[PDB]
Amino acid sequence: SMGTLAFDEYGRPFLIIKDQDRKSRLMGLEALKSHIMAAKAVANTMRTSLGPNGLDKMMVDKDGDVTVTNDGATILSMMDVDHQIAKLMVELSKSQDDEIGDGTTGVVVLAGALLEEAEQLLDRGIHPIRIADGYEQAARVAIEHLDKISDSVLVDIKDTEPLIQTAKTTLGSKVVNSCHRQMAEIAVNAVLTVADMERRDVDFELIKVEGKVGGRLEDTKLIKGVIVDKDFSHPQMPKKVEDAKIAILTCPFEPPKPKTKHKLDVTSVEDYKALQKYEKEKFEEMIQQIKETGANLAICQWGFDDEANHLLLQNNLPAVRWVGGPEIELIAIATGGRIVPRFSELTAEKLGFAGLVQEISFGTTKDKMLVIEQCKNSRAVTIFIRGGNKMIIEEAKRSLHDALCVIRNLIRDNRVVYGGGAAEISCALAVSQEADKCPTLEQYAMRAFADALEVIPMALSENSGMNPIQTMTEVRARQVKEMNPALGIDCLHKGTNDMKQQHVIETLIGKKQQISLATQMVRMILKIDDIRKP
Amino acid sequence: KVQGGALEDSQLVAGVAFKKTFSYAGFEMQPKKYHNPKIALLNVELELKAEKDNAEIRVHTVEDYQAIVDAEWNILYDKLEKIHHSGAKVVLSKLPIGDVATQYFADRDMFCAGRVPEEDLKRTMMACGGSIQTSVNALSADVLGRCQVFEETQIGGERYNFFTGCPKAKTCTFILRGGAEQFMEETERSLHDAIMI
Amino acid sequence: KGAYQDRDKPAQIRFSNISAAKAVADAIRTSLGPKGMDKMIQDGKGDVTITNDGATI
Amino acid sequence: KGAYQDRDKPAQIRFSNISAAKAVADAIRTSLGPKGMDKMIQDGKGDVTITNDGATILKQMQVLHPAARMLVELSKAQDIEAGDGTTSVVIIAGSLLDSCTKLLQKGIHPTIISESFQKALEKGIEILTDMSRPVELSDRETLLNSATTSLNSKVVSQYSSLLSPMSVNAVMKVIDPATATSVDLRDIKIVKKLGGTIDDCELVEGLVLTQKVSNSGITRVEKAKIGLIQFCLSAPKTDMDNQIVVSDYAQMDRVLREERAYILNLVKQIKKTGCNVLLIQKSILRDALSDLALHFLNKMKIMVIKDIEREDIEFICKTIGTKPVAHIDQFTADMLGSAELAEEVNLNGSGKLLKITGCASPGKTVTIVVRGSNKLVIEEAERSIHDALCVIRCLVKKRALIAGGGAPEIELALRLTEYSRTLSGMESYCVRAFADAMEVIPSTLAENAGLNPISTVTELRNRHAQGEKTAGINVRKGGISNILEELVVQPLLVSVSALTLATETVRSILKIDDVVNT
Amino acid sequence: ASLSLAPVNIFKAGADEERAETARLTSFIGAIAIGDLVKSTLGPKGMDKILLSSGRDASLMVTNDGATILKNIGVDNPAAKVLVDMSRVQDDEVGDGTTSVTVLAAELLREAESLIAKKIHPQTIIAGWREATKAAREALLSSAVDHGSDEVKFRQDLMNIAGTTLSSKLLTHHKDHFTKLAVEAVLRLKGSGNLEAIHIIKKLGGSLADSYLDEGFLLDKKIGVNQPKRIENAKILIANTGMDTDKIKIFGSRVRVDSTAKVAEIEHAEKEKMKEKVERILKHGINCFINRQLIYNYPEQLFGAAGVMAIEHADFAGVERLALVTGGEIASTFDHPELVKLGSCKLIEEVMIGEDKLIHFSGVALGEACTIVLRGATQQILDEAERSLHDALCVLAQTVKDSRTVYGGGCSEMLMAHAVTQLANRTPGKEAVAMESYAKALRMLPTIIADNAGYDSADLVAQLRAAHSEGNTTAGLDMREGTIGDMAILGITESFQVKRQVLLSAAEAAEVILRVDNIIKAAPRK
Amino acid sequence: DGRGKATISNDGATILKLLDVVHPAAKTLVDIAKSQDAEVGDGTTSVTL
Ligand SMILES: Nc1ncnc2c1ncn2[C@@H]1O[C@H](COP(=O)(O)OP(=O)(O)O)[C@@H](O)[C@H]1O
Ligand SMILES: Nc1ncnc2c1ncn2[C@@H]1O[C@H](COP(=O)(O)OP(=O)(O)O)[C@@H](O)[C@H]1O
Ligand SMILES: Nc1ncnc2c1ncn2[C@@H]1O[C@H](COP(=O)(O)OP(=O)(O)O)[C@@H](O)[C@H]1O
Ligand SMILES: Nc1ncnc2c1ncn2[C@@H]1O[C@H](COP(=O)(O)OP(=O)(O)O)[C@@H](O)[C@H]1O
Ligand SMILES: [Mg+2]
Ligand SMILES: [Mg+2]
Ligand SMILES: [Mg+2]
Ligand SMILES: [Mg+2]
């Protein structure tokens, strides 16, 4: 492990690279084995966070804040890694999360398993590129087999039971499985409310995921509208407004002010009195314009002053101030209103409508929130999460993100493979059959790919207390005997091994992305044979 | 380079594509698909601003004060109204487009993107077939751009604007997928080798 | 569901021992056979030893 | 065999708190009584402080143990409620805790100790009230004797003949004796000026100011009409950004001239009212007294004192009947104060003072000028005078008087011993502990006087049992006597509040069982 | 292999990865440390702690509140941090139960360590714990009683709840006093839950029984100089105006002239504007004027000449409470007096408390906000009294919101434990062995309550368990003599809200701590 | 790099740019690999070899 070790065949200094004495290098099979060791360490860390009986990890950051989670992407992001192959595995999980939002632990476990099998193949002397090419071949076979055994679900708003089952499968492994169906239902309703069916797009900016300590997890609900962390501007305004005609404004309720450098010169008592009357009349004109539009509520983005606040109160115009741009946008979208930049441009048509605007309390806290709901056809939505601690609230947020991403993936492609390791077992069977029909030296690489695909069912069995090899062999034999690629691991011990009957459901895009990403990253890792670093 | 996805999921767009650029409020009120849009490519800051940095207003009357306020607003609104009357349903600026302009275009059911990078702007120009305008006073169909489809879609965690359908396109945009920053970077280097070859 | 196996250090120790043993085996795999080569070993005192013998190595 | 009590840290914490409290009590035991001495305290910064005040001593010694901190807060609370007894209260608290030590050792629970202490407290309040005698605020001799008793403990006790009548006059001048239920000692202003001796302290019925006079030549004013000015005598300045743009040479001369004319009109509107003394509030953000204004005022023969503070305004108005004026339009003759004299008096080259004496509307305010040869003795004279004023305040609050010289403590000890013998149980031990603990103040008085504490306290107990409940330690004769003949009296409120606050602090400390290092 | 114990360490210098048994060890020891710390404050015979911070100011607190204790300690164990946050959230949700939720979570984790040693999976344990939580919830809800309809019995339940909330705290000395204080103060809110309406002023000095609830209102602000100090039949204008060199909000405005004479004219115009503002104010027909903002010398003079008491520098809280206590409208515009509602109180005087003067509003109109004067011998006594009063007021507010009540003295925990035991002995598998541990923790709650007094905790909890098995669903600890009794008669009752929240938050935190099999720490920022 | 950011490449010009070569004669191979990537875009490893 050194950059250059000669110093010359003549005794004269041999300096080629800067700080070559402080620099290191690993070349060849030892570099490959170091990579495999790092990847195996990461994967063996992650495999215990896989499945319903999977356990969580408690991450502590630089400043000592605690994060309890089962999400592989969050774990590997919070993990203070120094190894570059482990950094690649963190990138792998992040990529699975970006593209899919689920599978972030399966990808890592599977990639680690592929590298662990490549280890024995390299011991037997196969070229790492030949291993990578056999892995590509087997991965293509497995992807087509997934397309083959896939099923389809209806993504309609009438019967949402298949989507609820998919979301429940996604949320089975998370701490929020205490409110399993409630969480699944609200993730489904959220995406279906905010989803472009024709475009097949789902903008998550239209889903506001808010958390507030207090209450119970069961109190988490879907608001068809908006929630804001603000209150009415005056403490004597009413805390409830029903059938609210809302004026959304990005103009501070203050006297106008040019953006250009300006100096208004007062040169006489008459000029001073004119200025005074101008200010008074500006405040009165603002409030009068808001009133003549017919609004019963105003929502500004930039705060206002004492005269405007008291005039709103006097004129029976409850008002919120210092509302942020994103929530202003969501309020406009939800209430059907248009964002107005100045009072002169305000009309009865630019107003939004909410059947209820309320200020909500949270016990012995002094904190208030504003709920806007009972809109007609809100294309925006809010998920308000409650719970007994900020750790379970943050975990609920990320778990519900997983469920929303899964429903998004169904809206993008409704095809569905059955989980519990059943899809992996079926793909392993297909890859084994094709390796049997393959006469080149990659037969070994494809057999290794199959043995690696079989690590997810083994991991599920282990986490569920079952004997990995026994359970997997029995369910594999059953799959080959009675043709049913929906036969998998009974993690919850419902008796049956039929995942189609247990309604354990994954997205085809999810499994395909797992396989493809794991294989591509394993390829880039096997292609590395030299490490240099200080 | 869009992290997430497979190499076979990578793609070439016979047009131009670039990532969404720091939208303000009302951008979600804007539409996100246009089926024969005309495209205004500009080097213009569209927002309420000091008309000039060495400019100083001096008034001695509240009527003149109000006139000046309304004058700033009319300057902005006239720029926006010219852009609207050019027929352009999509608006791209190398310079910022403020929240007022964003909401104006959202109300007119137009699309706006500001702070677009210069390279992406020139590619949009070479693809759609217009010219980049520092002034909005001559927005002719000769200087406007055109594509058969404009869309904003999700690609692996990021939002991307696609101008597709340009038959006169002298430009293309590779969109590379993969599981790591360095994976995608070495993919780019490989493609650079192939392209130079 | 059998016994949870609340402890992971036994398995960790097993894997550590296996790794060390495999490392030794893979280190001397090159000194095996007619086509195998020798290793030079410089002791801490500086006593040099060239050898193909596994026990000696 | 009950519960094993597997934990010993609660008891260890109790004993540590008791030890700290007893250490504080034993540290200040020497500053108790007429024969008690003072402590010097050099702060970390080097600020020296000589004092006999328990609250001052404890606040100034940066105590670190929690229980000792709590005793500091206790002495401060006594200083608030009574202003006298801040040493007795700490000593009583320390003694109650030192007795809780052996109670705990006997194996009594802190809760039982606390409740029995509450019982002893209620019985002791009853006993002290029975001992007490009512007082009329017309009883000037009783007030003088209360003040003299309060001062006997301090460095200013050879000057009691001078500072007791002043401490009675001040309070009797700042309260309506028929309706008053309390006193605000902010009505009594104290002005510490170095120089002279403590025999030079003075009670000024009018007003005293340390601010200097701005006029030269006008130091004395008879038949003085005084005005408070909350506006600025300088060139006009709007609250908004204002400039004066000159574009012609003539406008320059015009600017100077019009400024002169503005200032002259101001000072003329001031002179027209008959004002000859002018108090100008302190003004940052604007010059309150320009040189032009001073020139014109001096030419008009008006004394000027600027830099008056915005916190002394209500006091100055309460004193000399002035009304603060913030706009020249409202500056008229009815907004002035008439004083028979206003003079800048010199103190033997030791500084200057503005004295506004004589007043047609001298409203319930007085000032005390404290003189002295050292900063330390001046500070302690101020503290002692405050203690005397607070004793008179206790007398105003509660029209009841109690004998001194440890007579209340001995009577308390005795009658609570009797109460303990009647309340047989485990409360009996705790009440007897409360009694013998309060029997420590007489012991301290005796030790400090120089007597045999055991013999003195035994004679006191014996005479109080015979019936002489107004019997105490006569440090003048050197033994026991009727303490009212020595005229050692103190308000019942002092003893009662000391007992109450000490018992509450003791119960609080007894409810503690652990210490954490957050 | 493992991330840490591998031939290659995959971590940056300063990081760490505790694995399964090591992680559960540090988690259980941290949680049980937190719990053992916070107990001994539990119950009537609970004792207080000295916090004794270590910063350079060295704040000193004497507390019996578990939330306060946990907030003010330097915790570095992650599971302990979880329990700390749990107690903080308890104090946010309700105002009581912050020591019971922590002790319960710690006892559940102790039982969970025992079960893991018994070789049970920390998913079979979580399953059984969720079933037991359901059973305990339903038993509690069935045991709850409501009296909000009957006004007299609701008053009695409020008094009992306040007494039970204060029993553990330093105010149990004067419990019958502070109970009445807190109940009257929470009923003066007339159904609102605004605890900011109840202002608490801690005045050093006096006895703890000298504390009281002012029949009107008290304010620690000053009156102007030439202005009255006593006002009978006070008409009050509550405001938030500037009244302090109040400039026109046009900020480019500048006075640019060519004459000091013109500058003086403009200055006089500013003063005339302030005078007209004061005149518009006075046209409301007032005797008192309270402003959230300052009041400068000139408006002070004007109010004095008008005979108006002008209180300045009240704050947002001050004017809110004043509006609640008098009926007025906080105003900033005075061009429509017919629309501005004024406040009323029979009298406004200046009173003495300790050595400080305060504005006293007596005979107020509404009274929907309150002032409580807390007297005491030490600042520590005063802060602990404020915390205890806050506890009691929060609980009474939550009860006025939800009149459901639940008996205390371990009766509720014993009833829930009985339900969990029935479920367990009717349930097969090792989930039954985890339900039994749930029940053991629920029982260990009153066990600890009794331990803190010095009684035969084992004997008394056995008696309670037998009673709740026989059907005496109201049996609880009688902590006067050290026996068992009828909580319904002794008046030891809690808010169903607080007991349910204790149960659920404890079970949830124990679940989330039990799901952890790895603790991956990142290099400290240092 | 010193910042800890890794670059993974099969491209010889890239690899040699990243190697902090300081030998005056061995800088010439890095330079000609750069020149090859400039003029052609392929052959960077072949040129050095
Ligand atoms: N109810 C269930 N029964 C059997 N297997 C399940 C069940 N729920 C989830 N799984 C399996 O556990 C695996 C891991 O899912 P999960 O841990 O939720 O996310 P990730 O795929 O990111 O690890 C999936 O492959 C799925 O097949
Ligand atoms: N000429 C040869 N051809 C093939 N194999 C050989 C030959 N000579 C020795 N071997 C094999 O080499 C191995 C032993 O080689 P060696 O390096 O001495 O190892 P060891 O120390 O185990 O004997 C045996 O398997 C032996 O059969
Ligand atoms: N002339 C005196 N003879 C006897 N006892 C006195 C005399 N003067 C004061 N005392 C007693 O001294 C005690 C107070 O002295 P002091 O040192 O001021 O302590 P504290 O700060 O507690 O008042 C009281 O018990 C009082 O009765
Ligand atoms: N007078 C009493 N008799 C019996 N038990 C009581 C009494 N007062 C309170 N408790 C019990 O003490 C527990 C509350 O103790 P406390 O120290 O206030 O902790 P927390 O902060 O959890 O409320 C509850 O179980 C309550 O029922
Ligand atoms: Mg999942
Ligand atoms: Mg004294
Ligand atoms: Mg409590
Ligand atoms: Mg090439």
> What DSSP letter does each residue of A271-299 carry, written as one string?
HHHHHHHHHHHHHHHHHHHHHHTT-SEEE
E422 secondary structure, DSSP code: H
Please compute, for residue D478, the number of CA atoms within 13 A of its CA located in the half-sphere on the CB side. Answer: 3
Contact by Cβ (8 Å): D52, D38: yes
Q: Give residues with Cβ within 8 angstroms of D152, minimum separation 6.
A: D33, D34, D160, D488
**Which is it for strands D400-403 and D133-134: parallel, antiparallel or unpaired?**
antiparallel
Residue B62 is assigned to a structural domain of this protein: yes
- For residue B188, the one-letter residue type is E
- Binary contact (E3, A42; C-beta < 8 A): yes
Distance, CA of A214 to CA of E247 (rounded, Å): 44
Contact by Cβ (8 Å): E314, E219: yes
Distance, CA of D257 to CA of E419 (rounded, Å): 97
Intra-chain end-to-end CA distance of chain F, in Å: 25
3-state secondary structure of F15: helix
Is A465 at the interface with chain C, CB within 8 A?
Answer: yes
The CA-based diameter of chain A, rounded to the nearest angstrom, is 103
- b or e along B134-169 (b: 16 or more beta carbons within 10 Å of the residue's beta carbon)? eebeebeeebbbbbeebbbebbbbebbbbbbbbeeb
Q: Is A51 in the pocket of ligand 1 (CB under 6 A)?
A: yes
Q: What are phi and psi of E461, to 5 degrees?
A: -70, -30
Total number of domains constituting chain B: 1
> Which of F7, F11, F40 lies at the smallest CB-CB distance from B182?
F7
A341 secondary structure, DSSP code: S
Contact by Cβ (8 Å): A102, A402: yes
Contact by Cβ (8 Å): B16, B92: no
Intra-chain end-to-end CA distance of chain E, in Å: 31
DSSP for B22-77 reads: ---TTTTTS--EESS-EEEEE---BSS--S-TT-EEEESSHHHHHHHHHHHHHHHH
Contact by Cβ (8 Å): D416, D127: yes
Residue B4 is assigned to a structural domain of this protein: no
Q: Give residues with Cβ within 8 angstroms of A129, minimum separation 6.
A: A526, A527
Please compute, for residue B5, the number of CA atoms within 13 A of its CA located in the half-sphere on the CB side. Answer: 17
Q: Give residues with Cβ within 8 angstroms of D484, minimum separation 6.
A: D403, D470
Distance, CA of D478 to CA of D474 (rounded, Å): 6
| Residue written as token pair 């060791």 | A37
Q: What are phi and psi of A355, to 5 degrees?
A: -70, -15
Distance, CA of D425 to CA of F10 (rounded, Å): 94
Q: Which of D49, D51, D56, D86 is catalytic?
A: D86
Q: Give residues with Cβ within 8 angstroms of D116, minimum separation 6.
A: D426, D427, D430, D431, D434
Q: Is the dihedral of CA B46, B49, B51, B54 positive or negative?
A: negative
Using a CB-CB distance cutoff of 8 angstroms, which residues of chain E are in contact with residue B65? 250, 252
CB atoms within 10 A of CB A270: 10
Is B32 at the interface with chain A, CB within 8 A?
Answer: yes
Sheet containing strand A381-387, strands side by side: A207-213, A381-387, A221-223
> Which of B29, B50, B156 lies at the smallest CB-CB distance from A260?
B50
Closest chain E residue to D78, measured at CA = E205
For residue E106, how far is its CA from the centre of ligand 7 (angstroms)?
18
User: Smallest Cα–Cα separation from A380: which of A340, A339, A332?
Assistant: A332
Distance, CA of A356 to CA of D32 (rounded, Å): 71
N residues, chain F: 49
Elucidation method? cryo-EM
Is F2 at the interface with chain A, CB within 8 A?
Answer: yes
- Binary contact (B193, F41; C-beta < 8 A): yes
- Binary contact (A389, E94; C-beta < 8 A): no
Q: Whose CA is nearest to atom 5 of ligand 4?
A: E409
DSSP for D245-278 reads: ---SHHHHHHHHHHHHHHHHHHHHHHHTTT--EE
User: Smallest Cα–Cα separation from D368: which of D167, D151, D82?
Assistant: D167
Distance, CA of E157 to CA of E149 (rounded, Å): 12
Distance, CA of A71 to CA of B53 (rounded, Å): 51
- Tokens found for residue D517: 């290092």
**Which is it for strands D352-357 and D207-209: parallel, antiparallel or unpaired?**
antiparallel
CA–centroid distance for B161 within its chain: 9
Range of B105's domain? 15-197
Please compute, for residue D410, the number of CA atoms within 13 A of its CA located in the half-sphere on the CB side. Answer: 32
* CB burial of residue B85 (10 Å; 0-12, 13-18, 19+): exposed
Contact by Cβ (8 Å): A71, A104: yes
Contact by Cβ (8 Å): A424, A454: yes
A48 secondary structure, DSSP code: G
- For residue E259, the one-letter residue type is S
Please give the number of the atom of ligand 2 that sits closest to the Cα of C36. Answer: 17
Best to test chain B binding among A91, A102, A194, A260 (most B CBs inside 10 Å): A260
Give the catalytic positions of A in this structure. Answer: 71, 104-105, 402
> Which of E51, E248, E377 lies at the smallest CB-CB distance from D505?
E377
Contact by Cβ (8 Å): D82, D491: yes
Contact by Cβ (8 Å): B88, B37: yes
| Residue written as token pair 């019967």 | A159
Provide the phi-psi class of A185: left if phi over 0, else alpha when psi is between -120 and 50, else beta.
Answer: alpha
- Give all strands (DSSP E) within B48-183, no chain letters: 56-59, 90-93, 111-113, 132-133, 145-146, 149-155, 158-164, 173-175, 177-178
Q: Is the dihedral of CA E459, E465, E469, E475 positive or negative?
A: positive
Distance, CA of E80 to CA of D62 (rounded, Å): 34
Q: Give residues with Cβ within 8 angstroms of D377, minimum separation 6.
A: D50, D155, D198
Residue B44 is assigned to a structural domain of this protein: yes
For residue E165, how far is its CA from the centre of ligand 7 (angstroms)?
4
Superfamily of domain A226-412: GroEL (3.50.7.10)
Q: Give residues with Cβ within 8 angstroms of B140, minimum separation 6.
A: B86
| Three state DSSP letters for D487-509 | CCEEEHHHHHHHHHHHHHHHHHH
Pocket test for ligand 1, best of A71, A173, A487, A513 (most atoms within 8 A of CB): A173
CB atoms within 10 A of CB A501: 13
Instruction: Give the dihedral of Cα atoms A263, A266, A270, A272; nearest 10 deg.
Output: 80
> Which of F6, F9, F40 lies at the smallest CB-CB distance from B189?
F9
**Which is it for strands D48-51 and D39-42: parallel, antiparallel or unpaired?**
antiparallel
Intra-chain end-to-end CA distance of chain A, in Å: 11
- b or e along C11-49 (b: 16 or more beta carbons within 10 Å of the residue's beta carbon)? ebeebbeeeeeeeeeeeeeebeeeeeeebeeeeeeeeee
Using a CB-CB distance cutoff of 8 angstroms, which residues of chain E are in contact with residue D330? 301, 305
- For residue B49, the one-letter residue type is K
Distance, CA of E324 to CA of C44 (rounded, Å): 88
Contact by Cβ (8 Å): E263, E257: yes
Distance, CA of A283 to CA of A315 (rounded, Å): 12
- Binary contact (C7, E20; C-beta < 8 A): yes
Q: What are phi and psi of A223, to 5 degrees?
A: -100, 125
Please give the number of the atom of ligand 4 that sits closest to the Cα of E164. Answer: 8
- b or e along A297-335 (b: 16 or more beta carbons within 10 Å of the residue's beta carbon)? bbbbbeebbbbbbbbbbbeebbbbbebebebbbbbbbbb
3-state secondary structure of D482: strand
The CA-based diameter of chain D, rounded to the nearest angstrom, is 108
- Binary contact (B180, A521; C-beta < 8 A): yes
Best to test chain F binding among A17, A80, A90 (most F CBs inside 10 Å): A17
Distance, CA of D155 to CA of D380 (rounded, Å): 7
Distance, CA of D177 to CA of D167 (rounded, Å): 15
Q: What are phi and psi of E159, to 5 degrees?
A: -60, -40
**Which is it for strands E309-311 and E288-291: parallel, antiparallel or unpaired?**
parallel
Q: Which of D49, D51, D56, D87 is catalytic?
A: D87
Strand partners, A297: A246
Distance, CA of B142 to CA of E12 (rounded, Å): 59
Closest chain E residue to C9, measured at CA = E21
CA–centroid distance for D473 within its chain: 27
- Give all strands (DSSP E) within A61-170, no chain letters: 66-69, 151-152
User: Smallest Cα–Cα separation from A340: which of A263, A270, A286?
Assistant: A286
Q: Give residues with Cβ within 8 angstroms of E123, minimum separation 6.
A: A53, A55
Provide the phi-psi class of D179: left if phi over 0, else alpha when psi is between -120 and 50, else beta.
Answer: alpha
Q: Is A171 in the pocket of ligand 1 (CB under 6 A)?
A: no
Distance, CA of D490 to CA of D485 (rounded, Å): 14
- Chains with 3+ CB–CB pairs under 8 A to F are A, B
Please compute, for residue D448, the number of CA atoms within 13 A of its CA located in the half-sphere on the CB side. Answer: 24
Ligand 4 contacts (CB < 6 A) are E 41-44, 46, 66, 96-100, 164, 167-168, 408-410, 449, 477, 479, 492, 494
- For residue A148, the one-letter residue type is K
- Binary contact (A338, B103; C-beta < 8 A): yes
Contact by Cβ (8 Å): E48, E378: no
Q: Give residues with Cβ within 8 angstroms of B84, minimum separation 6.
A: B104, B105, B108, B110
The CA-based diameter of chain E, rounded to the nearest angstrom, is 99
Let me know the angle formed at the C-alpha of D224 by D221 and D228, rounded to the nearest 5 degrees: 115
For chain D, which residues make up each domain, given as ranges?
Answer: 1-135+400-518, 136-205+364-399, 206-363
Distance, CA of E215 to CA of E208 (rounded, Å): 18
- Tokens found for residue D490: 């103190």
A234 secondary structure, DSSP code: S
Distance, CA of E492 to CA of E495 (rounded, Å): 11
Distance, CA of A459 to CA of A467 (rounded, Å): 10
Q: Is the dihedral of CA D414, D419, D425, D430 positive or negative?
A: negative
| Residue written as token pair 């003067």 | E357
Distance, CA of D361 to CA of D358 (rounded, Å): 9
Using a CB-CB distance cutoff of 8 angstroms, which residues of chain B are in contact with residue F41? 192-193, 195-197
Q: Is the dihedral of CA D374, D378, D379, D383 positive or negative?
A: positive
A56 secondary structure, DSSP code: E
Distance, CA of E30 to CA of E39 (rounded, Å): 14
User: Smallest Cα–Cα separation from E209: which of E231, E176, E239, E238?
Assistant: E176
User: Smallest Cα–Cα separation from A385: which of A164, A161, A182?
Assistant: A182
- Binary contact (B6, A517; C-beta < 8 A): yes
- Give all strands (DSSP E) within A274-414, no chain letters: 297-300, 319-320, 339-340, 352-361, 368-373, 381-387
- Binary contact (A84, F6; C-beta < 8 A): yes
User: Smallest Cα–Cα separation from D52: which of D93, D82, D87, D89?
Assistant: D87
Q: Give residues with Cβ within 8 angstroms of D291, minimum separation 6.
A: none
How many beta-carbon pairs below 8 A join chains A and B?
Answer: 149
| Residue written as token pair 């009670």 | D203
- b or e along E484-511 (b: 16 or more beta carbons within 10 Å of the residue's beta carbon)? bbbbbebbbbbbbbbbbbbbbbbbbbbb
Contact by Cβ (8 Å): E408, E164: yes
- Tokens found for residue D352: 């200057």
Q: CA-CA distances (angstroms) from residue A440 to A120, A144, A527, E509? A: 18, 21, 21, 56
Q: Is C37 in the pocket of ligand 2 (CB under 6 A)?
A: no
Pocket test for ligand 2, best of C29, C31, C32, C39 (most atoms within 8 A of CB): C32
- b or e along A30-64 (b: 16 or more beta carbons within 10 Å of the residue's beta carbon)? ebbbbbbbbbbbbbbbbbbbbbbbbbbbbbbeeee
Q: Specify whether D53 is catalytic.
A: yes
Is C17 at the interface with chain E, CB within 8 A?
Answer: no
DSSP for D311-380 reads: TSHHHHHHHH---EESSGGG--GGG-EEEEEEEEEE-TTS-EEEEEE--SS--S-EEEEE-BSSHHHHHH
For residue E63, how far is its CA from the centre of ligand 4 (angstroms)?
15
Q: CA-CA distances (angstroms) from residue D306 to D203, D209, D293, D342? A: 24, 11, 12, 15
CA–centroid distance for A411 within its chain: 16
Distance, CA of E231 to CA of E214 (rounded, Å): 18
Distance, CA of D406 to CA of D490 (rounded, Å): 11
For residue D120, how far is its CA from the centre of ligand 6 (angstroms)?
24
Give the CATH number of the domain where residue B150 resides.
3.50.7.10
User: Smallest Cα–Cα separation from D507: which of D117, D190, D166?
Assistant: D117
CB atoms within 10 A of CB A261: 15
Distance, CA of A75 to CA of A117 (rounded, Å): 24
Using a CB-CB distance cutoff of 8 angstroms, which residues of chain A are in contact with residue E519? 57-58, 60
